[PDB]
Amino acid sequence: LREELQLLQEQGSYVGEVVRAMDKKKVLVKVHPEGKFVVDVDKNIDINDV
Amino acid sequence: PIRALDEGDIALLKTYGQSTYSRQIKQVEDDIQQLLKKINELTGIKESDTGLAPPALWDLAADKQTLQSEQPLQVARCTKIINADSEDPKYIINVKQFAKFVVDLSDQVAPTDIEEGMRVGVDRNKYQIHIPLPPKIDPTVTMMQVEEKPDVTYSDVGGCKEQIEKLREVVETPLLHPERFVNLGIEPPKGVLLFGPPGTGKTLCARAVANRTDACFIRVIGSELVQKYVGEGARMVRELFEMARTKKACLIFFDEIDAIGGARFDDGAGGDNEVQRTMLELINQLDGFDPRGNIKVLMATNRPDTLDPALMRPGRLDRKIEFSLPDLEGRTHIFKIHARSMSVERDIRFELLARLCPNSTGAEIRSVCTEAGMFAIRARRKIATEKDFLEAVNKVIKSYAKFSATPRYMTYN
Amino acid sequence: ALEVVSEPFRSFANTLVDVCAYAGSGNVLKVQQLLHICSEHFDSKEKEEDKDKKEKKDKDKKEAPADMGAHQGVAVLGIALIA
Amino acid sequence: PTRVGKKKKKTKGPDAASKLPLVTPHTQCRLKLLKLERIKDYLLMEEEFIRNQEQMKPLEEKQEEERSKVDDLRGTPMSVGTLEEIIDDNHAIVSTSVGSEHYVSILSFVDKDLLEPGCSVLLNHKVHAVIGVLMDDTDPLVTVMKVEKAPQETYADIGGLDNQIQEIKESVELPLTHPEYYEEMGIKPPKGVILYGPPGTGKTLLAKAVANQTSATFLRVVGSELIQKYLGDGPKLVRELFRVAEEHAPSIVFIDEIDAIGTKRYDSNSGGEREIQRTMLELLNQLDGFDSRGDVKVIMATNRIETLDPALIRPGRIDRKIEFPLPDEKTKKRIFQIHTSRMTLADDVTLDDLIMAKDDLSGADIKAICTEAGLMALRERRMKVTNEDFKKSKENVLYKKQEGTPEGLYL
Numbered sequence: 039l040r041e042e043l044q045l046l047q048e049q050g051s052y053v054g055e056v057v058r059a060m061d062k063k064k065v066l067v068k069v070h071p072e073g074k075f076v077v078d079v080d081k082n083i084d085i086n087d088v
Numbered sequence: 089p090i091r092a093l094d095e096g097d098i099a100l101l102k103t104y105g106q107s108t109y110s111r112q113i114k115q116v117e118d119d120i121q122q123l124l125k126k127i128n129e130l131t132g133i134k135e136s137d138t139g140l141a142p143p144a145l146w147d148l149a150a151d152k153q154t155l156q157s158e159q160p161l162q163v164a165r166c167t168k169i170i171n172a173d174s175e176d177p178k179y180i181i182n183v184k185q186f187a188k189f190v191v192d193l194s195d196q197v198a199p200t201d202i203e204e205g206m207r208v209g210v211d212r213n214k215y216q217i218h219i220p221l222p223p224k225i226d227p228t229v230t231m232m233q234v235e236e237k238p239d240v241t242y243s244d245v246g247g248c249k250e251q252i253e254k255l256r257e258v259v260e261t262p263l264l265h266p267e268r269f270v271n272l273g274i275e276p277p278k279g280v281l282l283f284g285p286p287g288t289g290k291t292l293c294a295r296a297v298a299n300r301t302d303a304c305f306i307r308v309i310g311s312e313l314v315q316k317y318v319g320e321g322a323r324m325v326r327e328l329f330e331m332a333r334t335k336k337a338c339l340i341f342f343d344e345i346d347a348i349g350g351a352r353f354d355d356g357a358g359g360d361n362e363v364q365r366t367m368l369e370l371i372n373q374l375d376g377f378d379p380r381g382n383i384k385v386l387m388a389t390n391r392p393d394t395l396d397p398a399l400m401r402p403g404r405l406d407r408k409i410e411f412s413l414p415d416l417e418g419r420t421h422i423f424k425i426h427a428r429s430m431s432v433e434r435d436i437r438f439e440l441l442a443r444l445c446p447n448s449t450g451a452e453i454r455s456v457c458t459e460a461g462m463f464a465i466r467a468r469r470k471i472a473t474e475k476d477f478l479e480a481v482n483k484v485i486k487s488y489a490k491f492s493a494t495p496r497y498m499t500y501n
Numbered sequence: 502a503l504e505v506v507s508e509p510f511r512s513f514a515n516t517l518v519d520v521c522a523y524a525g526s527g528n529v530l531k532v533q534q535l536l537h538i539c540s541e542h543f544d545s546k547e548k549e550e551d552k553d554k555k556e557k558k559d560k561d562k563k564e565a566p567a568d569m570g571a572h573q574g575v576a577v578l579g580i581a582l583i584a
Numbered sequence: 585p586t587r588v589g590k591k592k593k594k595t596k597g598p599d600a601a602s603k604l605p606l607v608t609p610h611t612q613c614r615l616k617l618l619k620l621e622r623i624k625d626y627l628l629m630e631e632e633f634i635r636n637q638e639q640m641k642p643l644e645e646k647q648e649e650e651r652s653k654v655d656d657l658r659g660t661p662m663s664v665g666t667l668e669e670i671i672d673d674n675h676a677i678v679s680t681s682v683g684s685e686h687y688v689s690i691l692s693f694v695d696k697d698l699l700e701p702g703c704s705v706l707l708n709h710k711v712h713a714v715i716g717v718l719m720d721d722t723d724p725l726v727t728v729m730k731v732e733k734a735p736q737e738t739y740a741d742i743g744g745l746d747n748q749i750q751e752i753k754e755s756v757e758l759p760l761t762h763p764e765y766y767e768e769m770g771i772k773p774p775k776g777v778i779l780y781g782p783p784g785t786g787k788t789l790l791a792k793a794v795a796n797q798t799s800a801t802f803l804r805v806v807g808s809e810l811i812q813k814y815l816g817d818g819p820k821l822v823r824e825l826f827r828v829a830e831e832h833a834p835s836i837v838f839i840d841e842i843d844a845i846g847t848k849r850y851d852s853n854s855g856g857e858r859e860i861q862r863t864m865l866e867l868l869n870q871l872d873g874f875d876s877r878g879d880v881k882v883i884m885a886t887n888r889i890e891t892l893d894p895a896l897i898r899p900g901r902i903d904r905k906i907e908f909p910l911p912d913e914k915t916k917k918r919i920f921q922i923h924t925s926r927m928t929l930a931d932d933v934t935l936d937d938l939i940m941a942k943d944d945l946s947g948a949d950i951k952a953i954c955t956e957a958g959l960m961a962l963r964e965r966r967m968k969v970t971n972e973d974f975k976k977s978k979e980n981v982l983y984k985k986q987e988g989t990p991e992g993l994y995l
């Protein structure tokens with residue numbers, strides 16, 4: 039229960055649609071109400087999974 | 089009484105006939121298409137490299153100066169100024185998207201060049217004016233100032249000896265002899281519409297005067313006037329009719345003004361509302377208060393019936409040049425234009441060809457000239473014969489203009 | 502190859518008489534040893550002529566299989582080397 | 585100069601399909617077992633060679649200290665901006681999505697030679713500085729319409745249309761393969777082609793066979809594809825459509841079902857009718873209006889032709905009008921022959937039984953007859969197909985078209 043309470047006390051994530059990927063772990067994403075962005079990926083996700 | 093499926097009878101089918109090579113040929117095709125995939129993700133060589141210079145010149149900048157241009161450099165914004173007050177700054181400044189502040193000048197400014205309506209560099213924290221700016225020029229009229237010559241001479245607009253004569257009077261002659269109009273006491277017209285059947289030569293006369301202009305010429309893309317936002321298209325009209333007043337005697341060519349407004353109605357309470365606001369803004373900067381002076385407007389359409397009578401009034405569009413079909417002397421001149429630069433027999437006559445194109449346009453005549461050479465490539469020739477053109481007339485016109493009158497013709501001979 | 506058993510700059514000649522006898526057929530087992538021994542290695546300016554000449558002998562044994570491997574030749578050598 | 589900008593520095597990306605379209609035994613023979621195993625040999629070796637390529641790389645320098653600090657010089661959340669004007673003192677002006685405009689600097693390694701007001705750039709968050717410039721900027725609605733795969737077989741697939749096959753080859757394939765004939769007479773090849781006729785005749789096949797055997801790239805447009813609701817979103821996508829085709833290869837564009845894109849351009853009372861009618865009036869402008877055209881060919885296809893706008897039918901825009909009539913008693917044999925290629929055919933049948941007796945039916949009818957007769961064999965527990973399958977199949981397919989016209993007035 040304490041492990042359940044600490045993980046919920048954390049800022050939420052953003053949802054954004056990927057247009058298409060760049061090279062070397064970079065993509066091209068407009069969020070919802072902003073310009074587009076070139077960001078970095080995490081460990082568990084890959085370029086070929088996009 | 090027809091049923092022929094039961095799970096035991098399924099095993100009859102896939103063992104009868106090539107039990108040797110059925111799966112033996114199939115999974116070879118299956119895993120190679122899997123291997124088409126597994127090469128692609130193993131390559132992964134997309135490489136969208138952009139932005140970077142050649143890596144042999146920026147080495148001096150990105151040693152310390154780039155780190156020197158992070159923290160001391162400023163992310164200041166540009167704004168506009170309403171006014172000022174005496175003995176103090178008391179500067180009133182808007183953004184038109186953000187709020188309106190009342191701020192102070194900084195130390196690096198001269199307090200004289202803080203005139204009203206001026207773009208100025210504004211701090212992010214205390215919002216002080218730092219750097220004044222040159223004024224904004226409109227970005228999309230620069231995109232449509234042509235700055236380029238399309239190569240069509242007046243010798244290619246044959247069949248129109250009098251329509252060019254009307255069009256020479258309005259455009260070319262006051263720009264080169266602005267004397268005889270005043271020295272007799274007349275004024276030239278300032279708006280010419282072009283109307284008629286399609287493919288007749290509307291664009292050619294506009295393309296040929298862009299060659300011999302010696303003046304400012306502006307092509308205007310028609311559907312840039314129609315925008316997504318409300319009132320945005322009407323603002324695009326204004327910036328066009330301001331910079332024309334700055335320089336002297338600039339030409340503005342619209343094209344297919346059927347699209348940007350043809351009729352003003354309201355019965356179902358709605359519809360093309362935003363199109364009407366852009367279209368009526370075009371009218372009030374065409375006639376009204378503050379007449380424009382030396383701005384000549386050319387328009388061209390295919391459907392002149394469906395246009396607004398507010399544009400049909402002279403004073404906005406003054407000369408109605410129409411294009412018709414060339415009778416015989418026009419067409420015989422057109423064949424000599426479009427077939428002089430091609431390998432033909434040097435003894436053929438063209439007046440027999442101009443007979444067989446009774447109701448035809450300049451586009452249809454050129455299509456006959458291109459098609460006749462295509463018959464020469466159906467055979468193995470390098471020059472065109474008389475029967476090459478005679479089959480081309482039947483291919484272009486007679487294959488679509490008549491099918492009952494040619495076989496059952498015996499009412500006319 | 503057993504006649505000129507020698508140093509590797511004279512064993513540049515190993516790939517010559519190997520595949521000059523191999524003008525055209527399907528002997529794909531040779532085409533893999535035409536790749537897998539001296540493939541890349543990054544080779545700091547020592548046997549770079551030999552991997553060119555090993556690729557030189559990939560050029561034949563490709564021009565006779567009547568277009569069956571010619572599409573595969575332009576598919577591989579367009580992607581793998583110039584890429 | 586003479587060769588200003590050397591024409592946009594741009595290559596072309598054609599298709600990657602058609603690896604080996606030679607499976608020509610077309611039956612369960614050991615050749616196709618031998619041929620496909622050869623294809624297995626080369627692709628496995630292409631896999632293993634590039635597997636050795638990412639394996640035996642002992643080269644590490646990363647970026648010899650130059651790009652590595654640069655990749656740390658730029659921010660990690662790289663953002664997207666838009667130029668408004670260029671103040672060339674290494675301190676320019678940009679615009680964000682909301683319109684917040686910032687007197688940003690240029691933080692180097694960007695040549696000031698390919699940045700124009702309108703070209704989108706790359707920015708920071710902490711100082712908003714220009715780091716790079718965004719390239720290719722395609723809205724992801726036109727990239728969907730870019731074909732990567734050759735779908736079906738070549739000209740030997742369709743069952744005999746050779747008078748009109750030679751027509752479309754004169755305007756698409758032959759000017760691209762061998763443009764030496766045209767300079768000897770100075771005649772430009774035709775640009776626009778209409779495919780028209782009754783439905784079920786072969787219009788969609790003739791585009792797919794061209795898209796199979798080609799060298800330039802290919803674009804498909806399904807009818808009401810360029811229609812949106814934001815009153816300017818319609819004509820804006822048409823500009824980007826021809827922009828992508830012009831920037832890439834000397835390629836062709838296939839826009840199908842253009843009966844929903846043109847009808848005689850009349851003026852009426854509906855307000856949503858005009859943004860329909862306006863988008864379809866500037867396609868006229870991009871096609872054969874001002875400036876030039878480039879090497880872009882357009883292929884268009886309908887069922888009905890008389891309900892079109894006469895501004896599109898005129899030459900200059902479309903130079904070929906091609907009829908696809910219903911077949912004859914001769915090339916219809918080729919339709920039945922091809923659609924009965926790989927099916928076990930009993931020797932009792934005569935192909936000319938159903939051809940000569942009935943003289944009305946399309947090519948798409950014949951494919952339905954061949955599939956239905958194959959279903960009748962499994963319906964009565966058979967592999968081979970006899971005449972009695974085609975007797976029941978020629979009935980069951982054709983009972984979807986009404987009884988008749990007039991009675992025996994004429995004689």
Ligand SMILES: Nc1ncnc2c1ncn2[C@@H]1O[C@H](COP(=O)(O)OP(=O)(O)OP(=O)(O)O)[C@@H](O)[C@H]1O
Pocket residue numbers: 244245246247248285286287288289290291292389390422425449450451452454872895900
């Ligand atoms: N009078 C003419 N003399 C020579 N060539 C002509 C003439 N009229 C038309 N043509 C040829 O026909 C082609 C098409 O004409 P164009 O498109 O300019 O007609 P248009 O009236 O502008 O068409 P639209 O009304 O659809 O804009 C031109 O490229 C030109 O070569």
Ligand SMILES: Nc1ncnc2c1ncn2[C@@H]1O[C@H](COP(=O)(O)OP(=O)(O)OP(=O)(O)O)[C@@H](O)[C@H]1O
Pocket residue numbers: 741742743744745782783784785786787788789790886887919922947948951
């Ligand atoms: N001449 C032909 N030879 C071989 N097959 C044909 C022929 N004509 C039609 N077909 C068959 O018709 C199908 C293709 O349909 P088709 O190309 O006629 O559609 P379409 O003309 O676009 O029809 P619609 O106009 O109704 O959309 C294919 O499956 C093909 O098997």
Ligand SMILES: [Mg+2]
Pocket residue numbers: 290291292873
């Ligand atoms: Mg025109």
Ligand SMILES: [Mg+2]
Pocket residue numbers: 787788
């Ligand atoms: Mg179709």
